Amino acid sequence: LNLQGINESTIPKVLQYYSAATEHDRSWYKAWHAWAVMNFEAVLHYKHQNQARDEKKKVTEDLSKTLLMYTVPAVQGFFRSISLSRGNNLQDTLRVLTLWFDYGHWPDVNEALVEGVKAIQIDTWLQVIPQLIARIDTPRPLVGRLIHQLLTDIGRYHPQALIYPLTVASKSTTTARHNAANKILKNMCEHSNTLVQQAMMVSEELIRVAILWHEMWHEGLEEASRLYFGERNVKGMFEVLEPLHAMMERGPQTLKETSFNQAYGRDLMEAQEWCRKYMKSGNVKDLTQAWDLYYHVFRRISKQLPQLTSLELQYVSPKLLMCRDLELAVPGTYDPNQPIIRIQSIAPSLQVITSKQRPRKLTLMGSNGHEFVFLLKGHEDLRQDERVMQLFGLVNTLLANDPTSLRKNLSIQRYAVIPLSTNSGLIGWVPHCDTLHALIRDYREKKKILLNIEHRIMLRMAPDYDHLTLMQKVEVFEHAVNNTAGDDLAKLLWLKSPSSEVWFDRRTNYTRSLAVMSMVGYILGLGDRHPSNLMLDRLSGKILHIDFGDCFEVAMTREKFPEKIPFRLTRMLTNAMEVTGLDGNYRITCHTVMEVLREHKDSVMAVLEAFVYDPLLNWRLMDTNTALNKKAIQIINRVRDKLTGRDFSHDDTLDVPTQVELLIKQATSHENLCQCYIGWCPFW
Amino acid sequence: VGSDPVILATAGYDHTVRFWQAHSGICTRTVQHQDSQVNALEVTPDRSMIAAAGYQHIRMYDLNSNNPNPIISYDGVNKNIASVGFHEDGRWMYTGGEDCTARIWDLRSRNLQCQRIFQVNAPINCVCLHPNQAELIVGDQSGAIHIWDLKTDHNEQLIPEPEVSITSAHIDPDASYMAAVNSTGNCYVWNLTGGIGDEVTQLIPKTKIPAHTRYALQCRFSPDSTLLATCSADQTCKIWRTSNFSLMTELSIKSGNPGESSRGWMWGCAFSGDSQYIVTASSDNLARLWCVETGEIKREYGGHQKAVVCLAFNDSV
Amino acid sequence: ECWIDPLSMGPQKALETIGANLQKQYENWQPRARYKQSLDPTVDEVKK
């Protein structure tokens, strides 16, 4: 393959070889995995050659026989390579899913899958419960029937792995998803019943906590004001507000909802009368009375919202207060090997974090006795973060297997992510952390340094900084960098450390962890890495990345404030490392990480392809664009080019040392840094 | 300002355009330029009105009348206007912007909208009209020089070096050599094949001059076409002789002391009417009338609060 | 304070709330009197 390539003549040969290998060593893992992946590539080669030739009657019927000739070997092979690996089967299991979803509606592919699902152990599927439930409502009947039957048996053993994603699906807006999820829950109830009732309540109450009525009305009136006064979209304004009226038409279910309907509810209902009068009259004097009432409650809410520093369970949701010694386990703790750390009790107070999104700080008591703190984010879809955490798990496995990486103790710091709805979900709170912006703020207030000193120096030298040309910007940026000693993080890393011996270990960890997430972020495409989005462990010294909302070079694509920096490698971070510079620990660590990922490119590619192609996550790519299938193909191709090293130039392949060096120059380039949005803080 | 034969305007971040006098060094009158800086000035060959390319507006102020509001405010553009050319007949006006869309503006026509457009891949950094008034050289951030023909629209794209932003390029009045400059600090000289009607305009690479260490900013031949001034971010305005491509004189504004960071970039090079003197703007807020042979600051112009990005110079009788 | 936890409501609102409740409590005994609260007052404020 390396000499010839993939084409019509090599595939029958390399299959002849792998078949012989399988014969001479049946038990050998690699012989089956290579045969399976080769068949699977022979499938996708002839599929993409059909679309290249046929799209751009008899040929498709021949293609049916042709692909099914290579599809059944691939399935049988992946199932045998799953059992042999017994703990490193992620790649293989996802490939099974891709094959099943695409071609499993065929009778013959279904048969192979049925025999396989019987043979394979049920613990294997727990890895890929997200990807299964994503296709819970597949239009193909023969596929969907086998999904249900598999989920049923995942319910009967390891139900704690299923209740959370099933409860989220059960309350989906689209009818087919919720129907399928409820039909599966109906079967799950007979085995336990208690689990289904507990998780359905807890999740409903957590959602209620995650977005209160006055918070929903606040975001709704902001959207409705932008539609009316901005866009003059009156029918769309009613579409925003009428769910909030139907929301309150349930009635007061808690004391907080009672006191809301008392204070505001009368005015909202009165404003709805003017809205319903406008619907059957069409007067400006009618609708202006409604906007007067809407802006009355909006101003009262805006005045209230800073005062909501904390929420008491007795008021917001007493159901959760009553909850004692639940069998439903703590989210994202369940392991089939470990003993279930079930929820003991929920603490009565919720320390509401004062941010733009106003996250909560949930904390649960475990049955083992340890407290578990969480972050309850509202209106921020966490399915991306869930998928991204699956990727980090894979990469950590790969680094553990490589001896060089293991010796260096390379790994990505990750945290639990548990979605609760399309809007809200739970994030696992990482302790002993604080944002880089906070650290620098507190150091500069201690040392009496102005927090915005670099920005102020720029605006002093050239007050039109935003509107300056590229060369002008580079001058101003460099003048700021030369006239500010960028050592605040290095200095504060020293002062914070109790002793030099610890400091050295903290700094080694810091440098290596940063390099690891620089390369992984580059491949994944992770942008929008301002200092609020990365946090530093004040004990281990390892860096943590959060809020992976932007992926696949979305930041580069967007017209406004495009980011040309692949990963954050700013001057302050470089100073925090060894005095010599990036040439030492950072560069060597980058080489090792890149080499391992390139070696295991097939595993990384398989995980990436599945979540990108997922229909639920297609929305982000569609929003980035300006059909959907073509956009997804381009994104996958770019990621593949990065792993190969042909990203910079398609014509010439680049070795790992050369690729890393070019990446470092681009990240640290003054011209690229200056363009970046000022909120990104290219100067720190 | 206008009645005086020599003109010497100056403008930068302070929102003014100060019209100096070469014989004295006194600010005669300022002119307001709100909403933006000025990226490039240009006197018209007719000398009736100056130009002032800024952000989303090419303004053109009166040279004769004093203290007037902008005569023309060509709006309807975005992402700045890097440069402005001028047709020797005085009818057409060229521009270049970061929107990757060159333009031409008919001053005689009252229409606000432009006339022609030559879109390119990457943002256009500099324009330069060929003295024959038939070819329009167009640099860009990707490195691609172009020659958008003003009669056949046959652009002959050419990339001297891949992935280096060419920042300025000029062609001497005798159409002998064309020089280009990039952010590496090279000076690619091209020998012009003598074609006018044929419009072959073949560019023969002569010499890669290792002009500067750091970003170079503007190059411009003299009217004699014997000297090639080349400005850079190293605070030195080198002057290369056209024949031998050697450094005849190096005009530097360095401190003469290692303890002095970012004194200021030098991006001005306008030859005198007879190539005896050479004006030069710097980021230390000071224009400087240099001497070519000796290399001495004859007069210094001061009073600009902020940096000085533009110059204008006109000795046309 | 006046059967109201001041730290639950935040500083400024709590001070207004306690003044309102205190008025009600007194209005149980003397409902027909002009009440006028002074909340962290100055000296002039008390004088006037």
Side-chain angles (χ1 to χ4, degrees):
Chain A
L1 295 162
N2 199 69
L3 299 177
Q4 304 286 318
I6 314 171
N7 60 70
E8 295 292 303
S9 55
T10 65
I11 281 164
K13 292 183 185 175
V14 305
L15 283 164
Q16 186 80 296
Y17 291 148
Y18 288 148
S19 56
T22 257
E23 297 257 295
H24 296 301
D25 206 330
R26 295 286 173 188
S27 66
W28 180 27
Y29 163 68
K30 293 183 180 180
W32 284 108
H33 176 105
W35 187 58
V37 170
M38 172 41 55
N39 272 295
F40 180 76
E41 290 167 14
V43 178
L44 305 194
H45 176 262
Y46 282 67
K47 195 209 189 179
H48 201 93
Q49 188 163 310
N50 179 266
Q51 286 184 37
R53 293 181 177 182
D54 197 46
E55 290 282 298
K56 299 180 183 180
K57 300 183 176 188
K58 190 183 168 181
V59 187
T60 317
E61 295 186 327
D62 285 26
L63 196 81
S64 296
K65 286 193 179 181
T66 308
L67 298 193
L68 192 140
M69 174 171 63
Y70 305 131
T71 316
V72 182
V75 174
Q76 289 172 13
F78 282 123
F79 277 120
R80 208 163 310 182
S81 66
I82 281 174
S83 61
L84 292 175
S85 57
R86 219 56 204 96
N88 202 12
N89 63 34
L90 192 51
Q91 198 272 359
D92 291 318
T93 300
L94 284 174
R95 293 301 195 187
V96 171
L97 297 187
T98 286
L99 277 168
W100 175 7
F101 298 156
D102 298 11
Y103 309 105
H105 68 279
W106 284 326
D108 296 300
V109 174
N110 173 230
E111 271 195 317
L113 289 154
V114 168
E115 188 59 56
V117 165
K118 286 177 171 175
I120 190 179
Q121 296 262 25
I122 211 83
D123 295 11
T124 309
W125 300 109
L126 308 186
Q127 287 172 1
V128 300
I129 285 170
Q131 279 80 29
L132 284 170
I133 287 168
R135 314 306 188 80
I136 196 164
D137 65 305
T138 321
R140 295 146 166 180
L142 195 52
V143 165
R145 278 203 300 96
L146 177 63
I147 284 166
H148 300 340
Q149 191 260 97
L150 175 57
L151 285 160
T152 297
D153 300 330
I154 296 161
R156 197 167 61 263
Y157 295 93
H158 320 293
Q160 294 292 337
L162 251 187
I163 22 65
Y164 280 116
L166 267 169
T167 301
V168 179
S170 74
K171 66 185 68 162
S172 190
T173 323
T174 187
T175 190
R177 285 189 67 76
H178 106 264
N179 284 316
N182 279 121
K183 186 163 182 285
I184 295 157
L185 283 165
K186 285 162 78 85
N187 309 337
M188 276 208 58
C189 289
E190 71 209 359
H191 316 99
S192 299
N193 202 12
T194 53
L195 295 174
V196 177
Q197 307 308 313
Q198 281 187 12
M200 192 58 66
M201 168 261 291
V202 166
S203 72
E204 277 185 352
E205 297 317 298
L206 285 176
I207 289 163
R208 180 206 299 283
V209 173
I211 29 162
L212 305 171
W213 281 355
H214 39 257
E215 300 185 338
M216 289 177 82
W217 278 106
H218 183 89
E219 71 174 324
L221 292 170
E222 275 193 308
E223 188 58 35
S225 62
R226 294 285 75 75
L227 291 167
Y228 186 75
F229 281 89
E231 298 187 327
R232 301 284 157 185
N233 186 24
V234 187
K235 291 189 177 178
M237 176 265 289
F238 290 124
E239 295 170 44
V240 176
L241 300 180
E242 78 189 339
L244 301 177
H245 292 88
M247 170 194 76
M248 295 171 67
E249 206 160 37
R250 292 182 182 80
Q253 300 165 71
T254 54
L255 291 157
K256 200 83 193 173
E257 289 172 31
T258 317
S259 61
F260 180 88
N261 196 51
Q262 183 77 58
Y264 309 89
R266 181 179 180 274
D267 302 355
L268 278 299
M269 193 179 74
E270 220 294 315
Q272 192 180 8
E273 199 78 353
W274 289 106
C275 287
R276 291 164 70 177
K277 277 170 181 179
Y278 176 78
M279 292 169 184
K280 183 178 179 180
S281 69
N283 309 324
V284 180
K285 296 179 182 179
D286 283 41
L287 197 61
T288 191
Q289 295 284 119
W291 286 111
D292 191 21
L293 288 169
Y294 284 134
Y295 288 177
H296 182 89
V297 302
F298 185 88
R299 288 188 204 84
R300 286 168 58 190
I301 286 164
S302 305
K303 286 167 186 175
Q304 279 205 330
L305 286 168
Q307 299 290 301
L308 295 178
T309 51
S310 194
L311 307 176
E312 206 68 22
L313 259 53
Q314 65 175 131
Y315 302 119
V316 156
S317 184
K319 281 273 181 74
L320 288 175
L321 191 62
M322 165 273 288
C323 294
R324 303 292 156 179
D325 292 299
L326 272 52
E327 70 197 66
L328 179 264
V330 172
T333 66
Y334 181 74
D335 191 65
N337 312 327
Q338 310 311 321
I340 290 164
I341 306 158
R342 59 183 42 75
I343 295 177
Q344 207 288 322
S345 59
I346 303 135
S349 279
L350 295 168
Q351 193 265 107
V352 168
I353 306 306
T354 50
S355 305
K356 183 161 183 175
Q357 314 303 330
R358 266 187 316 288
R360 281 58 164 160
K361 198 189 152 186
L362 179 63
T363 171
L364 315 185
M365 190 66 72
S367 64
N368 71 334
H370 297 72
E371 279 182 43
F372 290 91
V373 183
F374 292 96
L375 198 78
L376 174 58
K377 288 274 200 81
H379 49 256
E380 281 203 322
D381 186 21
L382 289 160
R383 282 176 301 188
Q384 276 216 59
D385 283 47
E386 182 218 47
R387 298 298 183 105
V388 167
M389 291 293 147
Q390 197 181 23
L391 174 72
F392 294 164
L394 170 63
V395 174
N396 284 357
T397 319
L398 301 179
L399 300 173
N401 299 356
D402 182 62
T404 318
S405 312
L406 178 62
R407 181 62 149 150
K408 296 177 199 174
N409 306 311
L410 303 181
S411 39
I412 311 163
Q413 282 287 334
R414 44 202 281 270
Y415 49 87
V417 171
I418 318 291
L420 297 166
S421 65
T422 35
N423 286 131
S424 56
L426 299 171
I427 300 164
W429 177 267
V430 184
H432 313 307
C433 270
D434 37 24
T435 59
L436 175 63
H437 175 87
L439 286 165
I440 287 156
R441 184 171 44 71
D442 298 338
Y443 171 86
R444 284 181 174 187
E445 74 187 357
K446 184 186 186 285
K447 287 269 169 280
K448 304 288 185 179
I449 306 165
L450 234 52
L451 178 51
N452 306 348
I453 185 60
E454 292 97 335
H455 192 37
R456 185 168 274 94
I457 290 161
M458 291 177 183
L459 298 171
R460 196 185 295 109
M461 195 195 166
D464 308 292
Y465 180 74
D466 300 347
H467 305 152
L468 299 176
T469 63
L470 177 86
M471 279 290 99
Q472 286 169 354
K473 283 186 174 187
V474 168
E475 170 166 51
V476 171
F477 179 80
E478 283 181 1
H479 184 261
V481 161
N482 302 341
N483 300 337
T484 49
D487 61 17
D488 298 46
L489 184 61
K491 183 145 172 185
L492 85 82
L493 281 189
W494 165 256
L495 293 175
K496 206 176 193 62
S497 68
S499 59
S500 68
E501 293 177 350
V502 176
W503 162 77
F504 179 69
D505 292 26
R506 279 190 195 165
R507 194 186 65 173
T508 308
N509 291 0
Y510 159 79
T511 307
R512 293 176 176 164
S513 77
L514 200 75
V516 171
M517 269 305 300
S518 291
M519 295 303 95
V520 168
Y522 171 63
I523 278 154
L524 166 63
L526 181 60
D528 197 56
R529 315 258 54 70
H530 53 70
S532 289
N533 277 340
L534 42 95
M535 292 177 72
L536 209 144
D537 190 284
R538 83 173 66 92
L539 307 178
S540 72
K542 295 179 198 176
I543 202 67
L544 173 66
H545 287 256
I546 60 177
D547 198 19
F548 324 95
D550 291 357
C551 289
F552 312 117
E553 312 287 9
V554 157
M556 311 198 61
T557 313
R558 57 185 172 92
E559 310 300 319
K560 45 174 181 182
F561 297 114
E563 293 183 1
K564 304 306 175 185
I565 299 288
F567 46 85
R568 172 166 256 262
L569 197 48
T570 187
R571 65 182 181 88
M572 279 195 183
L573 299 183
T574 302
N575 291 23
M577 309 175 202
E578 48 271 346
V579 286
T580 59
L582 308 164
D583 308 346
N585 298 5
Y586 183 86
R587 194 163 295 174
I588 302 210
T589 303
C590 283
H591 289 357
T592 300
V593 177
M594 185 60 69
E595 279 281 358
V596 172
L597 292 172
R598 185 169 300 186
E599 175 191 2
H600 305 292
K601 61 166 301 301
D602 293 355
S603 306
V604 190
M605 279 310 295
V607 173
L608 287 152
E609 283 157 346
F611 78 97
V612 177
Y613 281 137
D614 202 46
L616 299 177
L617 294 178
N618 271 332
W619 73 291
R620 75 208 166 177
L621 325 168
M622 185 186 56
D623 297 349
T624 315
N625 181 31
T626 310
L628 232 176
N629 189 27
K630 184 179 181 178
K631 170 69 178 181
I633 292 174
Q634 299 157 358
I635 288 176
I636 270 123
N637 291 350
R638 179 60 211 268
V639 177
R640 193 180 311 272
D641 287 357
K642 293 176 181 175
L643 285 172
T644 62
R646 297 172 60 256
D647 42 12
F648 286 99
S649 57
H650 58 283
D651 291 324
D652 295 338
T653 312
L654 299 174
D655 48 289
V656 161
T658 296
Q659 185 197 8
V660 163
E661 201 69 23
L662 293 181
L663 275 174
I664 288 183
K665 302 311 170 185
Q666 188 185 353
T668 59
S669 172
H670 291 283
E671 301 184 356
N672 299 338
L673 278 169
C674 81
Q675 290 159 336
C676 277
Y677 176 56
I678 206 83
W680 198 84
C681 292
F683 26 84
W684 304 348
Chain B
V1 177
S3 58
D4 199 287
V6 178
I7 294 162
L8 169 47
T10 303
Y13 306 139
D14 74 328
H15 307 269
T16 65
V17 184
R18 310 206 181 187
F19 293 86
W20 302 93
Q21 286 187 321
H23 74 272
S24 68
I26 304 164
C27 191
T28 318
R29 77 191 190 87
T30 67
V31 191
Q32 302 301 143
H33 187 88
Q34 280 70 242
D35 305 310
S36 171
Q37 73 272 10
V38 184
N39 299 339
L41 298 159
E42 256 292 359
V43 176
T44 47
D46 55 52
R47 304 180 68 266
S48 62
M49 52 186 77
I50 202 162
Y55 180 68
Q56 306 186 317
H57 57 261
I58 299 108
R59 285 170 170 180
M60 296 181 67
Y61 306 164
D62 207 311
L63 284 158
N64 300 350
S65 76
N66 292 343
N67 297 357
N69 290 357
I71 311 296
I72 307 184
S73 295
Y74 277 141
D75 296 290
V77 175
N78 49 4
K79 280 169 289 300
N80 271 295
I81 296 108
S83 61
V84 175
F86 271 119
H87 198 246
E88 71 183 357
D89 297 14
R91 186 172 170 179
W92 298 113
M93 186 185 73
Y94 311 94
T95 76
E98 295 176 349
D99 40 22
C100 320
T101 33
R103 288 182 156 87
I104 304 180
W105 302 71
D106 199 356
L107 312 170
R108 294 189 193 173
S109 91
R110 205 182 305 268
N111 305 351
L112 291 179
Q113 300 181 0
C114 60
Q115 216 267 300
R116 299 163 60 186
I117 288 163
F118 169 56
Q119 187 153 25
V120 292
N121 292 113
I124 290 162
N125 293 320
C126 54
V127 157
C128 190
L129 184 68
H130 192 295
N132 66 341
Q133 311 294 286
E135 296 181 4
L136 191 73
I137 295 92
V138 176
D140 75 355
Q141 274 188 39
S142 54
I145 300 162
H146 301 81
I147 306 92
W148 174 36
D149 190 59
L150 303 171
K151 297 174 189 181
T152 59
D153 300 53
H154 268 298
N155 58 304
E156 301 181 4
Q157 181 164 359
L158 172 59
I159 297 162
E161 186 185 328
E163 308 299 332
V164 291
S165 172
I166 93 92
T167 63
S168 187
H170 198 242
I171 189 167
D172 75 285
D174 303 306
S176 52
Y177 303 94
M178 187 205 73
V181 145
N182 75 321
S183 61
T184 307
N186 315 341
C187 184
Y188 299 96
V189 193
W190 304 84
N191 289 30
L192 260 297
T193 306
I196 303 181
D198 298 351
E199 293 168 5
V200 279
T201 191
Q202 306 290 342
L203 289 183
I204 307 163
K206 179 149 185 185
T207 313
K208 293 179 179 179
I209 302 160
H212 309 269
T213 320
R214 302 190 58 205
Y215 319 98
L217 300 167
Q218 185 140 290
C219 57
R220 198 172 286 179
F221 291 93
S222 56
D224 276 319
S225 317
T226 319
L227 308 166
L228 176 61
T230 309
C231 308
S232 171
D234 60 358
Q235 316 188 179
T236 215
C237 172
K238 297 186 184 193
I239 298 164
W240 308 86
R241 63 175 73 267
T242 299
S243 56
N244 304 344
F245 294 120
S246 80
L247 178 51
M248 185 205 45
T249 311
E250 184 170 1
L251 318 174
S252 189
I253 56 155
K254 289 176 191 175
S255 195
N257 188 53
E260 179 58 45
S261 300
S262 195
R263 236 197 81 172
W265 291 14
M266 194 119 75
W267 36 27
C269 47
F271 284 87
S272 67
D274 61 347
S275 322
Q276 285 288 116
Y277 308 124
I278 168 161
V279 189
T280 296
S282 307
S283 306
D284 59 23
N285 321 317
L286 301 164
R288 289 187 185 79
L289 171 56
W290 300 79
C291 191
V292 171
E293 296 170 23
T294 325
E296 308 284 51
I297 298 164
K298 308 299 287 298
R299 293 188 177 271
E300 202 164 14
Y301 307 86
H304 262 90
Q305 287 80 26
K306 262 66 182 178
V308 175
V309 186
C310 305
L311 286 176
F313 198 82
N314 210 265
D315 297 359
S316 298
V317 181
Chain C
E1 184 80 10
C2 295
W3 304 109
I4 300 177
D5 192 342
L7 277 52
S8 63
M9 311 182 77
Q12 177 48 41
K13 192 193 172 189
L15 180 61
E16 296 167 46
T17 314
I18 295 158
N21 275 43
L22 183 58
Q23 192 179 292
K24 289 169 189 167
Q25 287 176 325
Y26 270 106
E27 285 171 356
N28 289 25
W29 307 109
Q30 181 55 266
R32 293 182 183 174
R34 270 174 196 74
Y35 291 85
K36 280 204 167 62
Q37 298 164 24
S38 317
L39 300 162
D40 298 0
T42 59
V43 177
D44 300 34
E45 188 165 318
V46 168
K47 179 189 253 181
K48 288 149 194 182

